[PDB]
Write a protein that binds this ligand. Structure first.
Ligand SMILES: [Mg+2]
Ligand SMILES: [Mg+2]
Ligand SMILES: [Mg+2]
Ligand SMILES: [Mg+2]
Ligand SMILES: [Mg+2]
Ligand SMILES: [Mg+2]
Ligand SMILES: [Mg+2]
Ligand SMILES: [Mg+2]
Ligand SMILES: [Mg+2]
Ligand SMILES: [Mg+2]
Ligand SMILES: [Mg+2]
Ligand SMILES: [Mg+2]
Ligand SMILES: [Mg+2]
Ligand SMILES: [Mg+2]
Ligand SMILES: [Mg+2]
Ligand SMILES: [Mg+2]
Ligand SMILES: [Mg+2]
Ligand SMILES: [Mg+2]
Ligand SMILES: [Mg+2]
Ligand SMILES: [Mg+2]
Ligand SMILES: [Mg+2]
Ligand SMILES: [Mg+2]
Ligand SMILES: [Mg+2]
Ligand SMILES: [Mg+2]
Ligand SMILES: [Mg+2]
Ligand SMILES: [Mg+2]
Ligand SMILES: [Mg+2]
Ligand SMILES: [Mg+2]
Ligand SMILES: [Mg+2]
Ligand SMILES: [Mg+2]
Ligand SMILES: [Mg+2]
Ligand SMILES: [Mg+2]
Ligand SMILES: [Mg+2]
Ligand SMILES: [Mg+2]
Ligand SMILES: [Mg+2]
Ligand SMILES: [Mg+2]
Ligand SMILES: [Mg+2]
Ligand SMILES: [Mg+2]
Ligand SMILES: [Mg+2]
Ligand SMILES: [Mg+2]
Ligand SMILES: [Mg+2]
Ligand SMILES: [Mg+2]
Ligand SMILES: [Mg+2]
Ligand SMILES: [Mg+2]
Ligand SMILES: [Mg+2]
Ligand SMILES: [Mg+2]
Ligand SMILES: [Mg+2]
Ligand SMILES: [Mg+2]
Ligand SMILES: [Mg+2]
Ligand SMILES: [Mg+2]
Ligand SMILES: [Mg+2]
Ligand SMILES: [Mg+2]
Ligand SMILES: [Mg+2]
Ligand SMILES: [Mg+2]
Ligand SMILES: [Mg+2]
Ligand SMILES: [Mg+2]
Ligand SMILES: [Mg+2]
Ligand SMILES: [Mg+2]
Ligand SMILES: [Mg+2]
Ligand SMILES: [Mg+2]
Ligand SMILES: [Mg+2]
Ligand SMILES: [Mg+2]
Ligand SMILES: [Mg+2]
Ligand SMILES: [Mg+2]
Ligand SMILES: [Mg+2]
Ligand SMILES: [Mg+2]
Ligand SMILES: [Mg+2]
Ligand SMILES: [Mg+2]
Ligand SMILES: [Mg+2]
Ligand SMILES: [Mg+2]
Ligand SMILES: [Mg+2]
Ligand SMILES: [Mg+2]
Ligand SMILES: [Mg+2]
Ligand SMILES: [Mg+2]
Ligand SMILES: [Mg+2]
Ligand SMILES: [Mg+2]
Ligand SMILES: [Mg+2]
Ligand SMILES: [Mg+2]
Ligand SMILES: [Mg+2]
Ligand SMILES: [Mg+2]
Ligand SMILES: [Mg+2]
Ligand SMILES: [Mg+2]
Ligand SMILES: [Mg+2]
Ligand SMILES: [Mg+2]
Ligand SMILES: [Mg+2]
Ligand SMILES: [Mg+2]
Ligand SMILES: [Mg+2]
Ligand SMILES: [Mg+2]
Ligand SMILES: [Mg+2]
Ligand SMILES: [Mg+2]
Ligand SMILES: [Mg+2]
Ligand SMILES: [Mg+2]
Ligand SMILES: [Mg+2]
Ligand SMILES: [Mg+2]
Ligand SMILES: [Mg+2]
Ligand SMILES: [Mg+2]
Ligand SMILES: [Mg+2]
Ligand SMILES: [Mg+2]
Ligand SMILES: [Mg+2]
Ligand SMILES: [Mg+2]
Ligand SMILES: [Mg+2]
Ligand SMILES: [Mg+2]
Ligand SMILES: [Mg+2]
Ligand SMILES: [Mg+2]
Lengths: 10, 46
RNA sequence: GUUUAGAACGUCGUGAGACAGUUCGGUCCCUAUCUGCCGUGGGCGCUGGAGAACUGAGGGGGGCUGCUCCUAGUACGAGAGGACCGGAGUGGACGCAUCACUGGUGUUCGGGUUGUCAUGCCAAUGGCACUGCCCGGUAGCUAAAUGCGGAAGAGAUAAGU
RNA sequence: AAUUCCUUGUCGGGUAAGUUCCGACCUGCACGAAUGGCGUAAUGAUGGCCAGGCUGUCUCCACCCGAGACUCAGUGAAAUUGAACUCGCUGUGAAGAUGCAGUGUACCCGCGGCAAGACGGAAAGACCCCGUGAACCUUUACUAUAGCUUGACACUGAACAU
RNA sequence: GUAACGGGGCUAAACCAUGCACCGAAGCUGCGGCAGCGACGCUUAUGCGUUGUUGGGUAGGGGAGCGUUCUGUAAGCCUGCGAAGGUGUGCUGUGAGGCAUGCUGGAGGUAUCAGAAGUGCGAAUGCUGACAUAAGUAACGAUAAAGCGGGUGAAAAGCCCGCUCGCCGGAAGACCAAGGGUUCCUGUCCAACGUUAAUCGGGGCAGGGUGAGUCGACCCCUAAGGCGAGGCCGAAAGGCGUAGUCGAUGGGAAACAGGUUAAUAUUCCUGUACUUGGUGUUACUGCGAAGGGGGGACGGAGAAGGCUAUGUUGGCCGGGCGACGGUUGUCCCGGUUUAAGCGUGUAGGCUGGUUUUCCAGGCAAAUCCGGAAAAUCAAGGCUGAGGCGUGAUGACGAGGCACUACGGUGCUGAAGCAACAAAUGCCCUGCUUCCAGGAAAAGCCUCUAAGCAUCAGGUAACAUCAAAUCGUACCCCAAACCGACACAGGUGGUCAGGUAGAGAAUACCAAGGCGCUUGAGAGAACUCGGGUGAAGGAACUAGGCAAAAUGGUGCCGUAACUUCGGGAGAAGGCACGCUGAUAUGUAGGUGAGGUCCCUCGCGGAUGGAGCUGAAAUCAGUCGAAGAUACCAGCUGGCUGCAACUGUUUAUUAAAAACACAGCACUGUGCAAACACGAAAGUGGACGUAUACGGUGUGACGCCUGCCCGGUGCCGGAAGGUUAAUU
RNA sequence: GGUUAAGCGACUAAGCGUACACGGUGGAUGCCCUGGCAGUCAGAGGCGAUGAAGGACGUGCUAAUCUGCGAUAAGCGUCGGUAAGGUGAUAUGAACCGUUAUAACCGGCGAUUUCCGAAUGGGGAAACCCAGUGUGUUUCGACACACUAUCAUUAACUGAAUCCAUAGGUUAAUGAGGCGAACCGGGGGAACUGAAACAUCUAAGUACCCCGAGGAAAAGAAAUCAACCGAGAUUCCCCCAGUAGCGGCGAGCGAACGGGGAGCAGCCCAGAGCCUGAAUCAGUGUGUGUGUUAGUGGAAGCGUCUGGAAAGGCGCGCGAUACAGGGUGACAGCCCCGUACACAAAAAUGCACAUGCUGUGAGCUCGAUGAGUAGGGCGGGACACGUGGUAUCCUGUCUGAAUAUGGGGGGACCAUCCUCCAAGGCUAAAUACUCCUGACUGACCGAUAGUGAACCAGUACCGUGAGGGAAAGGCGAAAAGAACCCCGGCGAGGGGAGUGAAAAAGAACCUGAAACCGUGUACGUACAAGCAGUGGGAGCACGCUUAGGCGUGUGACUGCGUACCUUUUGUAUAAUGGGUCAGCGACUUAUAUUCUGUAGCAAGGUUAACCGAAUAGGGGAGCCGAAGGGAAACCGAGUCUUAACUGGGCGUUAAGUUGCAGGGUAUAGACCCGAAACCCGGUGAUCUAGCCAUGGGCAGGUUGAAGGUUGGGUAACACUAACUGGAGGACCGAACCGACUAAUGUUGAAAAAUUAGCGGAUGACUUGUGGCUGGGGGUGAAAGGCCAAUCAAACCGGGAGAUAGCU
């Protein structure tokens, strides 16, 4: 399995 | 790092053994399903 | 910093919560195929083969400047003050090369020393402990060390005469 | 002020220079007394600020020791991939071009490197919006309901006093 | 990057005004071909010099076909003179296609006209299988380290042997439990497995290997808890639970040393023991419970004392006279080991002891326990290390000679002592102390009931039997277990050598075990782990992040503030090596011989030999440096928050958050409130308001003001309003 | 000719491209079926304390596994069948047994039948542990059998409080326990979904859970319907009819009367006689008949040709109540097994008829005629019917009759009239289903299909567990499975040889495609810019032709030319999709309705169930059409509207109906794939959180509380000094535990770690072994944390193909 990171602008 | 599986024969037989399963009808229904499915190993007991 | 989940203040809301209000804490991945770029090779071509030295089409680098001195305390100015032009000297920044000097390093050189082990023992050595810890140090590499560079001069010109 | 929007408020201290810190001021945008107020020794991998020591943190990097990177031998992946005979510029164009137009440049092919671009790779976007989507949670949203509570009847009968 | 003619270039190759040419499209016209449609000429379901006209096309509508599998046609036809399938070639139709053939293959295939569909695939981050790409690139798994000679082999960096080197040594050693299940040993083999090769292996293959009265398990006994006759409850299922019955992680009988296998051993062998039952004999005889009592039987912390394990030194025995100066010496090396059991009962710990008597108590009884009195004894009893003796004229033992397959085998075999130090082990389930006040049962001991008291049974001494069954190899902080891996991770217990050190830290070593399953070169950038650094010293940066620095013991000295404890190791400073002297090895510790005493022993008092051994001072001496390495606090000042130790988002947040002691409010009278449960019941609690639950606040200090309108809560009940019911 | 100069200049291929040839990899295509799928006709619908289902371990000449079997262990006895061969399979071999009937094999009936499992002597972690009693054994150590669970029922014996009694207790007899597919009855009972939301409603009394029974079950013999005529139990089918109705009158739900069929069966008690054992039923024996469980016979061909082989070809025959099929070296009526027909049972058993016993009562007369019930109030449920004006049925609650001179019903209610007699029971058939047995069938599949499984498949494997769950078929006719030689490591692999029709069938074995990867040849390619092709085109190579030149391959050079799909106003777009190949993969099916086409009949058309030797025929029950208008009564080629229409609305000349095909619509999953979720039943506290029980661990070094003693002080204290003491969620710091900072690593050594530092380290510590709390629940010093790498509602299965106006 895995995960994600929203470093992008909100 | 300690994982989810720590072997214990006494605990394993007391939890899923033939006599533990057959004590209740719900476990006895598991045996009926496994007998109907034709499982080679009915319970976890050796 | 903003921009998650934690928490708190003020504020809003009955409340859950909310606030370009504020406070504290809080995971930034990718072994380069292609283009591009910096280097460095292989292949073939250039009309016999081969070894050298060149011409320079073309391309790139480089192009900064201060302060003193002389001109001259002259021109200018009542004075206070104070040059143009031109010529010297000495710096800053930048760049290149170099290690003679000044230094760094020099776990491959020499020495001192702690603990312990070994070489039968003593003595003398060696191993290990960050090179055990230190003191020095050749060559090399290196800068903070020291040499050099920016130009002058032409051609055609900009604005302008 | 963990609270002050205006705001880096004003004054003082600290610095060569302090939007932070410390002391005050009160003008409390929008503090406040057990959703505690103010103080408080000690404690804190607590937050902010200052000083000494200390240093390659930095001015400004140099050298050295190892492990990789490089070469040889052996074994031998991966994400990705429409197909490629996969240059620059200007312009155009589902509006930021290796592929179109024009034009320039460029012998064929490796190796070591750097990551500017291939709107690079990763994951049917978490922000925004939408669906008469989902879920939890809140309440004086709706409709109910467990529970709690009221009375009648039944279980439950007979004297007396008001 | 010229970039505002597409470019070149142009003074007309621009613009303006006239012309005549030419170029220019799938438009138009020619010359063929196909198809749709309209009214005709004859003929017309067909069709004819027809003719006119139309034919871009998504969504979509209409129409006509191809091909695939199957059924009828088809018990036909095609086919070992080569069917289907595959792979080429040729021809043909507007198309989906069709026809034929060469080769492959070796047994099916199927005309025609109808019928039926799992009837046509490039996409769906489609599904399954196969194969690419990156790519011979990354990686080959801790930087603890390897090297050589020899051997085996087809082949050796990796296997075997040997000699060095390096690593661990509170582990990276040894022994277990749990867990695994043969991985153990031997032989054999190198496909696959091993991140390379491999002769090797935890790989393949074939054999062998696990021996118990005493170790465990089983067994007896109970804890939490489970199950649970009857029982209670619940639509059914079922839930709870009594008597009971299970359930160790706990309590209960007994074995040690030596030797031995390729692999097992407190299990086999040797030697020497022990225990519980059964049976028999003999003697003496009150036995007896589903009963009673005792016992089992229990905390934390701390303090020593007595010991042993163990270590050191000396002595003794054996060996050595040194590859290079010295080494017959106070020299060097090695050894100096012995259990359970039995006897003694020691240091020490605990308790007064012994009779008689009574008694509504211990569910009845009791001779026991618990009570009441009286007498008399100055003791007695219990427990317990260790030592010593025995075990043991034995075993073991350096070494020795002979044989032999490097093993080995056989024989022999000296000394086998003392002092000192010393545990975290033992005495100790003790002692002392504290509050938070620290299992059970059975075995065991004792007491009597009923039921026997000739008997049985009990006690004692012999003899004798019996002690079954199961586990036992091996790994067990790891390549064998948990992590997909021969995985830098995790995993409980036991053992605890030397030097230095307070120490189980740390460094170097012993025993023992390893060098981590790809290497060999090269010595770029860059990256990682480190070393050093002129001068400056936080100018860096959000921030002294990181690094550097500090670091020990003794002594001196130490502020604000404080809850008087602290702050405090505050800060700051001084002394540390070696040698000698005091004092040839001191103070101290230990303590033999000897000499007295004993109602006599493991005795007491003297006594000081011999060992062990700081600390200080003085003097000398070496270095730049003596806490020299490793190891090992940076410090101070102001301030916010939280009192504090603690807890928390396993896997980006350890905080000011949560908890917290304390405080207050409120509920709760015990069949308590409350909570879990359709209920029974259970928790609360075997507690009782000095208690419990809920809520908020959050040590401590000083304090906590005003509002009851709103919303809740509490109390009242006259009136208004109001359900079922009648 | 030589020397210069200028111009031009092929030949090079490290490699690459295209074409062709030859291979490798791979297992598609085709062919095949001892496997599946759907059915038809029958049978059989249970097994079990006489120990089941399902297993464990054993058992052979046996090393493993499979299949059998159970210590009598691939088997023993007996009775039949049958027999010349035979000791199950992988799977040979060895050692043997048989051959005319005790080899073997098949069937009937027995014997044996370890251990676990309802499991039953007790216990237990299933295949293990521990007994008691009694009988019988003796080698005095022991040994062998038997019995000993619980509950229900019955009968004995004993036996409390408590005098009898009763409860209770002890025996002894019977019975029940469990397993199993669907169908059936009953007790409980969803949600997703639909309503384009969502409450009533729908889904649905479905899924699921629980209880019980049978081969069927259930229902069942009118207090029923009808309507003034009548019908006459129940069940099932076709109609009636998507009608009447129900319904936020929305979605949707949905009869009955009556008719046509299948099949029909009626009785008993509520009581006594007169008769009498009557009919009938059940037990059982006793035969017959017909099955079942082994079996027997079963017709008829040769020659020649091709070919490895004949069943094929070409000839000439023969059988057929047998030309159903299978096998045999290619396609067999006559080769083989069978098939059609004709036969068979020692023993067991089914079915049916008859008969004998054991029960069982038939008939007649006179009586009797189901009361806390009907009904009612309240609250619900069931009837198509949701409270509505709601009859009828069931009742949680509260009441409560009449009783034949009486009650019930006739869809509110009343009267009248019909009809029936509740409050006690029994009852076959027609109906539903298939775990299982046998035979047969298919415009069903043919190894990615068909069961998940054609193969040692519910296996390997995954998960703690519930549970999930694969991949994998083909040599040839016969293994004749390659003797021997050679290379190699006493290998692997390969070359010969040999076998065979073929090895171009060699076990990596039928056919062997494509992607992909090679070797060879031809051509092109090292000054050349881009979807890589197209139009033109030299040259070279090559095949034909005869010089007409065509054909093939390559292609210098040149004009033109920015992939495909999806989604869009618009994509070369720097928007989505795709590494490639092969295989698979999406508009179907059922019913109804409308329309079109077509066929038949026609003012008619046509049947459905069912019957039926049965695609025929029967059955016209019904359905549509020929007449409409109106709300309806009604009227009618008219009718309604209105008082009435000269009117107006709707109708009146116009052919339909039944098949078949097709286009739509409707209900079902409805073209395929995809949610996050909701609901139901289970599995998880071997991880983690808390708690419970029982054990363990915490080197070393400091600080020095209370208290105590001894002084000083006080009248005594207090106070003070010294010395003892050893207090603490005390200090420093290893083990141990935590995880604050930074670096590395992030296709990890590791799906959270390592290195250097960091905090705690006698406690609210830490740890071992057990135990307990379970999913709207747990647990939580509280973060929405944790509850098996998953948590704002775990996991598994089911509803389920939820739904998806979206892609
Ligand atoms: Mg921030
Ligand atoms: Mg940060
Ligand atoms: Mg970081
Ligand atoms: Mg980065
Ligand atoms: Mg030099
Ligand atoms: Mg150096
Ligand atoms: Mg030595
Ligand atoms: Mg070293
Ligand atoms: Mg120097
Ligand atoms: Mg100039
Ligand atoms: Mg000039
Ligand atoms: Mg000018
Ligand atoms: Mg501000
Ligand atoms: Mg200021
Ligand atoms: Mg301030
Ligand atoms: Mg406030
Ligand atoms: Mg308050
Ligand atoms: Mg702070
Ligand atoms: Mg400082
Ligand atoms: Mg290096
Ligand atoms: Mg790949
Ligand atoms: Mg490109
Ligand atoms: Mg552009
Ligand atoms: Mg490269
Ligand atoms: Mg980069
Ligand atoms: Mg909207
Ligand atoms: Mg023209
Ligand atoms: Mg045209
Ligand atoms: Mg067919
Ligand atoms: Mg062909
Ligand atoms: Mg063949
Ligand atoms: Mg299809
Ligand atoms: Mg390589
Ligand atoms: Mg690469
Ligand atoms: Mg590499
Ligand atoms: Mg390694
Ligand atoms: Mg070697
Ligand atoms: Mg070492
Ligand atoms: Mg093995
Ligand atoms: Mg081994
Ligand atoms: Mg090999
Ligand atoms: Mg092995
Ligand atoms: Mg023994
Ligand atoms: Mg044993
Ligand atoms: Mg023991
Ligand atoms: Mg119970
Ligand atoms: Mg019971
Ligand atoms: Mg135990
Ligand atoms: Mg104590
Ligand atoms: Mg000793
Ligand atoms: Mg010498
Ligand atoms: Mg004593
Ligand atoms: Mg062992
Ligand atoms: Mg061993
Ligand atoms: Mg593993
Ligand atoms: Mg551990
Ligand atoms: Mg350094
Ligand atoms: Mg410096
Ligand atoms: Mg310096
Ligand atoms: Mg700064
Ligand atoms: Mg720091
Ligand atoms: Mg301080
Ligand atoms: Mg502040
Ligand atoms: Mg975290
Ligand atoms: Mg953290
Ligand atoms: Mg608080
Ligand atoms: Mg008030
Ligand atoms: Mg109030
Ligand atoms: Mg076929
Ligand atoms: Mg809806
Ligand atoms: Mg039956
Ligand atoms: Mg026959
Ligand atoms: Mg009646
Ligand atoms: Mg009633
Ligand atoms: Mg009602
Ligand atoms: Mg109404
Ligand atoms: Mg209504
Ligand atoms: Mg009603
Ligand atoms: Mg396959
Ligand atoms: Mg083949
Ligand atoms: Mg060229
Ligand atoms: Mg072209
Ligand atoms: Mg498409
Ligand atoms: Mg694109
Ligand atoms: Mg893609
Ligand atoms: Mg029609
Ligand atoms: Mg008919
Ligand atoms: Mg009719
Ligand atoms: Mg009219
Ligand atoms: Mg249709
Ligand atoms: Mg549809
Ligand atoms: Mg502490
Ligand atoms: Mg502390
Ligand atoms: Mg934690
Ligand atoms: Mg990093
Ligand atoms: Mg893993
Ligand atoms: Mg500490
Ligand atoms: Mg929770
Ligand atoms: Mg939150
Ligand atoms: Mg989790
Ligand atoms: Mg939910
Ligand atoms: Mg599920
Ligand atoms: Mg559904
Ligand atoms: Mg779906």
């Amino acid at each position: 399995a895995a995960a994600v990171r929203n470093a992008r602008w909100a | 790092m300690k994982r989810t599986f720590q072997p214990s024969v006494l605990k394993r037989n007391r939890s899923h053994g033939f006599r533990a399963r057959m004590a209740t009808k719900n476990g006895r229904q598991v045996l009926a399903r496994r007998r109907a499915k034709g499982r080679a190993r009915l319970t976890v007991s050796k």
